[PDB]
Design a protein around this ligand. Structure first.
Ligand code: NAG
Ligand code: NAG
Ligand code: NAG
Ligand code: NAG
Ligand code: NAG
Ligand code: CL
Ligand code: CL
Ligand code: CL
Lengths: 284, 289
């Protein structure tokens, strides 16, 4: 049975699609053998406790572009084979219970962008050893706590840009030894701990532009061994004695890096740091 | 002019006392000269923002034993001289905005016990540098995030018992250099990071009884130079080779420590670990195991 104006088909995968159908909640009568459920584009307010427990074969679930305000902690419980979970474009969700994603040992990608998330609870990403893609962009995140991604061993892409992150602690990115791309641009990053990127050995892309970075020690870039692209523009760079560590590292870096424009001093008229001579940096 | 009912007296402190009067909300027209406001015992469900502005000289605010459901983020904005805030016994409050306590640089004691608090948001205790007493007991806390009390450099008492805290991370208690009594009993504590007490040099009392502690490294108690009272009862202690580090630390501890009862093995059941011989702490029942 198809739960109404939905569309139900079996090839290639057992699919139940209910997109842009004025649904006010998760409909009743979804086939228990479904492997793909698309509830995007409706006005679903709450995801109750039961929801999708019947679908033991479920791997793809889309709930984006709804009116999600509350998601029960047991919303996706027992969905052992879930590979993709889409909750993006729900700017009125604001908060997720830290046990919501417990038990999803097969989850490959998790979309949580433009959800207005105020914070990331302790243990929110615990156990997600299968996670590869994590989208947390354009939320209201105001802190990046330690060990938040300690279990994401297979995580390759992490998107944190478009938040209000003020700093980076030491063990914030602990455990991400498979991370390839890390995007932190368009935040309020004013400081980074010297040893933050220690686990990022295979990181190839780092976007730090459009932040509040005044200076950056070379030590934070030392562990990055596979780095091939680096974005640092749109930052209040102070080019003097404090920039010499980053300056020396930038003369040796092999990959393609963006401009490092000096906000200060006034004498240096908005020039690139990589192209400055050693004798320009004075003023620790 | 004092509001309806209530009590307003000048000495010792300018007081607007309206307790146990059946108020449904904060009474309007509270005198601006008030140094102490007692609204406890009523049925106030919400506290709007700026509800106590104009009361610049306010130092004491009691809102306990009410029916609080939501506190506005700017409820205490402008209370630069508030010394004591009492929000306890509101087990339906559940959540407090992490910016609610910003600016209260003179706050000395903060009562948040029996509020139904579920978690502690980032920066909830930002800049509370004068805070000395923090009552967070008998709530629904499920985690003690790192750096939660990093700003509370003048805190001497921290009450966390009666929650459901499962562990103590590495930096849960960082920045608490003045801490005297830390109470963590009646929780779900199963493991403590060896360096969780690194900044607690002046600690004199530590309660850890009634938890699920199977073992405790000797390094966790190493920073506690000033310890005089330590409670470890009501824990499932495994008294085998893993307890030798804790056992040796207990042989040189000069303070008063409670009983450390053995859950396993059954031949040592309820024997005090301190009073066992080293030859008892052999075998297994886990590097040594
Ligand atoms: C899962 O799919 C198989 C076929 O691949 C089917 O036989 C089985 O009944 C399905 N079970 C559920 C719970 O959907
Ligand atoms: C995660 O990595 C482990 C090896 O560390 C591997 O066995 C497992 O298949 C990986 N899972 C995914 C979803 O990539
Ligand atoms: C606070 O008290 C001082 C003197 O004790 C007085 O000058 C000031 O006006 C008082 N403020 C208010 C709001 O009553
Ligand atoms: C902290 O307490 C000490 C006394 O132990 C006192 O001297 C100091 O002024 C206090 N600091 C603040 C910011 O309240
Ligand atoms: C018992 O200890 C375990 C750790 O082995 C912990 O996960 C669990 O929450 C504890 N339960 C209780 C009731 O203390
Ligand atoms: Cl797809
Ligand atoms: Cl840290
Ligand atoms: Cl319980």
């Amino acid at each position: 049975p198809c739960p109404g104006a939905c569309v139900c088909y079996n090839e290639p995968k057992v699919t139940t699609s209910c997109p842009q159908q004025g649904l006010q909640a998760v409909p009743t009568g979804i086939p228990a053998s479904s492997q793909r459920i698309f509830l995007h584009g409706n006005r679903i307010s709450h995801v109750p406790a039961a929801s999708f427990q019947s679908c033991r074969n479920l791997t793809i679930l889309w709930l984006h572009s709804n009116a999600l305000a509350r998601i029960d902690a047991a919303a996706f419980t027992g969905l052992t084979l879930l590979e993709q979970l889409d909750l993006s474009d729900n700017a009125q969700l604001h908060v997720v219970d830290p046990t919501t994603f417990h038990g999803l040992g097969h989850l490959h990608t998790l979309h949580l962008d433009r959800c207005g998330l105020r914070e990331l609870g302790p243990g929110l990403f615990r156990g997600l050893a299968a996670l590869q893609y994590l989208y947390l962009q354009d939320n209201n995140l105001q802190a990046l706590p330690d060990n938040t991604f300690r279990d994401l061993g297979n995580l390759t892409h992490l998107f944190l840009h478009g938040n209000r992150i003020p700093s980076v602690p030491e063990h914030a990115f602990r455990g991400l030894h498979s991370l390839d791309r890390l995007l932190l641009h368009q935040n309020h990053v004013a400081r980074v701990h010297p040893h933050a990127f220690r686990d990022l050995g295979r990181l190839m892309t780092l976007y730090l532009f459009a932040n509040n970075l005044s200076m950056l020690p070379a030590e934070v870039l030392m562990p990055l061994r596979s780095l091939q692209y680096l974005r640092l523009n749109d930052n209040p760079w102070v080019c003097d004695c404090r920039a010499r560590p980053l300056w020396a590292w930038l003369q040796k870096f092999r990959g393609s890096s963006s401009e490092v424009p000096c906000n200060l001093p006034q004498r240096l008229a908005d020039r690139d740091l990589k192209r400055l001579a050693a004798s320009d940096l004075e003023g620790c």
